[PDB]
Design a protein around this ligand. Structure first.
Ligand SMILES: Nc1ncnc2c1ncn2[C@@H]1O[C@H](COP(=O)(O)OP(=O)(O)O)[C@@H](O)[C@H]1O
Ligand SMILES: Nc1ncnc2c1ncn2[C@@H]1O[C@H](COP(=O)(O)OP(=O)(O)O)[C@@H](O)[C@H]1O
Ligand code: BEF
Ligand SMILES: [Mg+2]
Ligand SMILES: [Mg+2]
Lengths: 361, 49, 361
């Protein structure tokens, strides 16, 4: 048997391997701590090794020996760099985004909010703003313009029909879903398993794209899992909980040693919840990109419903050469002025003309 | 611009062309704003040209 | 001796048979846990069976044998997919609504909130704000346009005179009620018991229209129900109060395998309570439709007191054909502009001219 499955090392030093449902299932197999010490591995690594059939009164098979780990030999597993020691940089490998299917919205995304590899941005909108629809659009854009990169999408606490529509419409890309139907412990389990596996893949020098759904309601999911809050951060946040969103989020970084980890996700804002505002403010100082989205623009059905002025990037030069840097500088000195609504319709008209470069040309 | 067909050369209307009330005779352009023009139309023409 | 009604499996491993009184009755019949296992039966199923009278020292009738379940033999009942894995889609079967009594209200509904089978809609407004008799109107229109659909109405936390009135004036359709006079426990019992019967009814490929009164007054009544359920959210809410209402409302869905479950419920908002408003947004992220009703309209006795601008559907194309979707595309590009009060009168006049399609005709 080929064992595609990632280490869920339980409390007592033995592990599990979840299935394609991306949750605790039948094909879990024990991962003894002795093998952990032997291989100098981290949990969540793609491990393949000979497994013997379970015997009478014996429930989960014991890993005799790992032959190919991460499709690699054991010695590489024993001697491989540690992730946290890698040098983070600013994103230098920008991601070009031109789409025929929606030239307007995605081209607005590109010309306004350029994306690089290792990017840790946050797009924000109130509930019922199609943030999932924008996720779909950008996912297809990446699958078209940059098919080389591994695209992964995680959905939390959402409607099942939307999940089915996405999965049918995503065309086989790795889509992870955890609806609000599921109990929250399942939510957090799946989220953290994806976290560790992605960490392993980046640790193997990969370009890992993680598209997380709605970090804010994910934060509510944590609070539902996370009992105490300690003292109540106003309305029921939690320091140690959000650290797991914090660790999951700040892990995104541009690494000078090859590979990259770009994770993008959305936030629910203007919900009347001080908690949502606090999470937005807290991760606002963490991400290097923000894409605000105005509700009344969506009321006008104008997509994308971006709050352009609040939107922006850090190190505009570090994704854009000095000529592109200065031309973007001029373009911001230009577009920093004109009024939002008219901005959206008449920019829709002006970018309806030609390609992004052609429009600039 | 549709009625501009009678305005052939630069500003001056072509000789021998019949004119009705409400039709352009000379196309004169002033500045949009006394001290500051419209940022809307200014940025319009800025990113077109 | 035939025993009839809906199965209410008691918590102690035995069961009951409830009658049309739509509450805890004494016409109950025992279904032991072993019976549950061997027939694999669920509660709420339309049960017709043979039973025996209670014995000495025994107080409730005991079942003898099962013959009819949901008007079907038990043998087929053992072989049927359970609800959870059923593939949901978006609504596909709209319902035309031009009713002779008030074609204006139904016309506004069709133009603004087209109704399809399996829809999860919503209408929002403060108390005493134009909901119940509009629900009456739409129920009556459904009673003519779609007599096939099993239409059910649930009343929670309202005045008994309204209960009785709608009872006669619904023309015999399935009306369930639980007044505010009642203790909260009866509210919960009736609400979830209706939920579960509807679950089984749609489980047989049936189209079920659920007319829930007062979804957010249900939320307030659930807060009154809520003994603690967790940690204090803003406004007095706690953590896990929503899940039973959320599992309740999110059950609305369009299923690919046939039938449907369209639930429309009325939301109370703008009550000056953080609790109520927060529930408004958090269930706003759950429903596929909301219908806003502002109070400046109703204080003017303007009916239907619809805030047209805020209302809008999800995925028109998925329920509305490409020609129909395109014509409403053009129309929404047209109808988005006009200002609220003058919008009210001019749109009212325009729809007073001719029927929707007749207007297009
Ligand atoms: N850019 C867009 N393109 C198309 N539809 C959109 C867009 N933005 C919002 N919507 C609409 O908003 C509705 C609800 O928002 P949705 O994207 O589903 O939620 P989320 O807030 O998770 O993104 C969707 O049905 C969608 O039709
Ligand atoms: N379509 C309508 N036209 C006129 N009046 C209506 C309409 N629908 C409801 N009403 C009135 O508005 C009130 C709101 O009903 P209900 O939903 O019980 O109140 P609330 O939800 O505000 O507690 C009802 O008493 C009814 O008289
Ligand atoms: F997080 Be800020 F840039 F200080
Ligand atoms: Mg969504
Ligand atoms: Mg009323």
């Amino acid at each position: 048997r080929l064992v595609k499955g990632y280490l869920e090392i339980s409390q007592d030093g033995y592990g599990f391997l979840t299935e394609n449902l991306h949750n605790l299932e039948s094909r879990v197999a024990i991962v003894s701590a002795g093998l952990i010490k032997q291989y100098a591995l981290r949990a969540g690594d793609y491990v393949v090794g000979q497994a013997r059939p379970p015997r009478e009164n014996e429930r989960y098979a014991t890993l005799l020996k790992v032959e190919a780990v991460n499709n690699l030999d054991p010695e590489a597993a024993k001697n491989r760099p540690r992730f946290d020691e890698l040098t983070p940089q600013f994103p230098d490998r920008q991601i070009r985004l031109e789409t025929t299917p929606d030239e307007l919205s995605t081209r607005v995304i590109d010309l306004l909010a350029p994306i690089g590899r290792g990017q840790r941005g946050l797009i924000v909108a109130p509930p019922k703003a199609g943030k999932t629809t924008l996720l779909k659009k950008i996912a297809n854009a990446v699958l078209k313009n940059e098919p080389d990169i591994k695209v992964i999408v995680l959905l939390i606490d959402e409607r099942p029909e939307e999940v089915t529509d996405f999965r049918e419409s995503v065309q086989g890309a790795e889509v992870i879903a955890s609806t609000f139907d599921e109990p929250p412990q399942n939510h957090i389990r799946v989220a953290e398993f994806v976290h560790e596996r992605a960490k392993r893949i980046v640790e193997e020098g990969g370009h890992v794209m993680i598209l997380l759904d709605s970090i804010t309601r994910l934060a509510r999911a944590n609070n539902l899992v996370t009992p105490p809050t300690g003292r109540t951060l106003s309305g029921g946040l939690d320091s140690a909980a959000l650290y797991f969103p914090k660790r999951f989020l700040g892990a995104a970084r541009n690494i000078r040693g090859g590979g990259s980890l770009t994770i993008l996700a959305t936030a629910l804002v203007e919900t009347g919840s001080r908690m949502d505002d606090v999470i937005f403010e807290e991760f606002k100082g963490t991400g290097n990109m923000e894409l605000h989205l105005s509700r009344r623009l969506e009321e006008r059905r104008i997509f994308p419903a971006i709050d352009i002025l609040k939107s922006g990037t850090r190190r505009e030069e570090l994704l854009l050469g000095e000529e592109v840097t200065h031309k973007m500088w001029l373009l911001r000195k230009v577009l920093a002025d004109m009024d939002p609504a008219e901005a959206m319709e008449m920019l829709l008209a002006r970018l309806a003309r030609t390609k992004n470069n052609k429009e600039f040309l | 611009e549709a009625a501009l067909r009678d305005l052939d050369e630069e500003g001056v209307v072509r000789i021998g062309a019949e004119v009705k009330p409400g039709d352009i005779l000379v196309g004169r352009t002033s500045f949009k704003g006394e001290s500051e023009p419209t940022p809307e139309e200014r940025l319009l023409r800025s990113i077109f040209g």
